[PDB]
Write an enzyme that holds these catalytic residues in place. Sequence first.
Site, PDB file in Angstrom:
ATOM      1  N   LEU A 192      -3.198  11.558   3.886  1.00 40.64           N
ATOM      2  CA  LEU A 192      -1.921  11.421   3.222  1.00 40.64           C
ATOM      3  C   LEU A 192      -1.900  11.891   1.788  1.00 40.64           C
ATOM      4  O   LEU A 192      -2.966  12.059   1.133  1.00 40.64           O
ATOM      5  CB  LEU A 192      -1.441   9.993   3.235  1.00 40.64           C
ATOM      6  CG  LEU A 192      -1.279   9.357   4.603  1.00 40.64           C
ATOM      7  CD1 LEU A 192      -0.878   7.901   4.411  1.00 40.64           C
ATOM      8  CD2 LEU A 192      -0.214  10.122   5.428  1.00 40.64           C
ATOM      9  N   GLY A 231       2.797   1.184   3.486  1.00 40.56           N
ATOM     10  CA  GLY A 231       3.786   0.106   3.506  1.00 40.56           C
ATOM     11  C   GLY A 231       4.960   0.418   2.626  1.00 40.56           C
ATOM     12  O   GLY A 231       6.094   0.302   3.056  1.00 40.56           O
ATOM     13  N   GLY A 265       0.853  -1.214   0.000  1.00 37.72           N
ATOM     14  CA  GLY A 265       0.000   0.000   0.000  1.00 37.72           C
ATOM     15  C   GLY A 265       0.869   1.237   0.000  1.00 37.72           C
ATOM     16  O   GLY A 265       2.072   1.097   0.121  1.00 37.72           O
ATOM     17  N   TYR A 323     -14.945   0.382   9.630  1.00 39.91           N
ATOM     18  CA  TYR A 323     -13.481   0.459   9.555  1.00 39.91           C
ATOM     19  C   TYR A 323     -12.909   1.218  10.761  1.00 39.91           C
ATOM     20  O   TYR A 323     -11.956   0.777  11.422  1.00 39.91           O
ATOM     21  CB  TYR A 323     -13.144   1.173   8.256  1.00 39.91           C
ATOM     22  CG  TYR A 323     -11.691   1.460   8.003  1.00 39.91           C
ATOM     23  CD1 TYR A 323     -10.853   0.488   7.482  1.00 39.91           C
ATOM     24  CD2 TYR A 323     -11.185   2.721   8.235  1.00 39.91           C
ATOM     25  CE1 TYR A 323      -9.505   0.766   7.216  1.00 39.91           C
ATOM     26  CE2 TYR A 323      -9.858   3.027   7.947  1.00 39.91           C
ATOM     27  CZ  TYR A 323      -9.030   2.046   7.427  1.00 39.91           C
ATOM     28  OH  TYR A 323      -7.736   2.386   7.174  1.00 39.91           O
TER      29      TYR A 323
END
Lengths: 347, 347
Positions: free
Chosen positions: B168, B18, B15, B138
């Site tokens: 982000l 990551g 991702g 979530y």
Amino acid sequence: GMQKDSKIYIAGHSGLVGSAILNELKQQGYKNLVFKTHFELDLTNQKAVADFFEREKPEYVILAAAKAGGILANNTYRADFIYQNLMIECNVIHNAYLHKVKKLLFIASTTVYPKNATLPTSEEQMLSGDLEYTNKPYAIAKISGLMLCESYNLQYNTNFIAITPTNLYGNNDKFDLEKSHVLPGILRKMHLAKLLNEKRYEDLLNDLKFDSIEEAKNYLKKFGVDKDNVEIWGSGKPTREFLHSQDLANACLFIMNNIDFKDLKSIEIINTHLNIGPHKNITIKELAELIKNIVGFKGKLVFNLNRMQKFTDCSKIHSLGWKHKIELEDGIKMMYKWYLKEQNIRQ
Amino acid sequence: GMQKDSKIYIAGHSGLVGSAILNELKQQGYKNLVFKTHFELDLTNQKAVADFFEREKPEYVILAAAKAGGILANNTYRADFIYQNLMIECNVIHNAYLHKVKKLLFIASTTVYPKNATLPTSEEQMLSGDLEYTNKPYAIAKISGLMLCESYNLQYNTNFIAITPTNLYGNNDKFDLEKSHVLPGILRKMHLAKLLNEKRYEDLLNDLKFDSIEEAKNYLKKFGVDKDNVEIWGSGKPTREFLHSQDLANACLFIMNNIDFKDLKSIEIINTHLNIGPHKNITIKELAELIKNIVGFKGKLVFNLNRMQKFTDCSKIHSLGWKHKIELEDGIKMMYKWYLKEQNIRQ
């Protein structure tokens, strides 16, 4: 509805909840019942739960199994209380969807509600404020269990019902004056004060397992009890509420037979869980009065100013056709009658 | 701190998170890196995760793996978004305790905060009010992940750190004008308006993959763009905030090397997670101005009154010795320079 021959798996069948439920299933004619001890089925074990559901194919699931304990255990075993409950919840709820369970009931509690929620506390107040510290991990696990049920229902059209019962009581309460809840603790204190007040010393010795009257009297001072007085700590202004375990069990049955996810939707679908309770609360002081009267203690109650509010809104379960049947005074008489029979003491 | 030869397992390594993290681990000299694709390790599978941790014995874990998606996926796949995240979280966090991992980092997000929280939003505002509907499952899974880390730390003295980064951005953003975020979407709109305004038609055709100028012009009307004007929807009063993925990755490293659970306690220990962000927010209108200037578009911005507030408090990470280094204007220039290079268009 569930048929009498429908296969109904009850997970967590030995706790106060599971037991009441097994009993009520028997009362209503359900024979085809499955349940396992921990020793036999670790509900935190993904493979074991999936193998159980594979071998058994239950039509209906009632999930009452939880890692739960008292104030101390919740505050000590914080990791175990969130991790095990999350795992029990995920394994059973997911497998039920996978194995095409017809209907699931998940039993949580009013632990899901904010500590400073306004009264009466409807299902719509969930997450409107912060949780009590001491049970915070268990409470989050339960909120997750609610959200699992509602999520599976919204994504996959399952019929997974979640309930949030208020504080429970029964005839299976503990009357250990060291470790007991407010209701059985005041009931036994009040009974002991009656025994001293009426000079029923054989009963008093027997109740306490003492063999000196004077030592019995000294010992009851620790609990605020003498022959004229019972001391309650505080002003007696805090409120509590009580749901009898048999009423909870009846409401579980009623839900399984008469309330489906579609009854609980109204386009953002939230708070489709159901409060279960008496739609009623009571002050410690009022409670103490009722117990004084039931016991027939003739002395005085003293509220010692050296050292919380609760009211769960059960409107929604009422509008769906279920009301509790055991009023507090009746439930306390029944408990006292079981208590006296187990102590072999007469009224 | 982590040694260069320490074995560091990065879960969810592909991702945006990551990836940034793997890159920064490489930058700082870490060779001994493990990670697996889904195809290779189903993190929802209890046995697979336990067998991984048995065979590999990682010293450090960075858990960036999640089932996540856009607004639509979160609102469609509600069961998958709570169940998978709960399972990934429980399996990795529990096994790490069991396998004696030295330190774990769990990456959540500001999704954990109430929708109407006051600004700036400190970690202490967690659970102070209700969550946004669309990502509610979530978000609960992430709150559970926080509580797992804090619970294991309090019960078992593990060193499991949880962070909640804000929105982000990077150079790995999508500039698909159909599906893209506010920042890359305005940047590309603004660039396209510059191209029309300066009559740079080879660039315009190339950027859009069109071959008729007139069709290119018609098509840009759908996005509020012509040669004199770029239309922004709304007044431009809503705020956003932005953390560059490289700043997030740096803060992950800094945390692993310099911030332990003991730095984050103060007797009721809550909200020991850490916000990561620029400690700064910006209006859509201001953002649009900055992008206009960077792009060098010379025409007009129009805010069309036909059709939210955010500010994450990062005081606490600041008081622990880390501040973001990439200011918004620099991060947008860098993105634009990558963008132009990938479109083979000059400034």
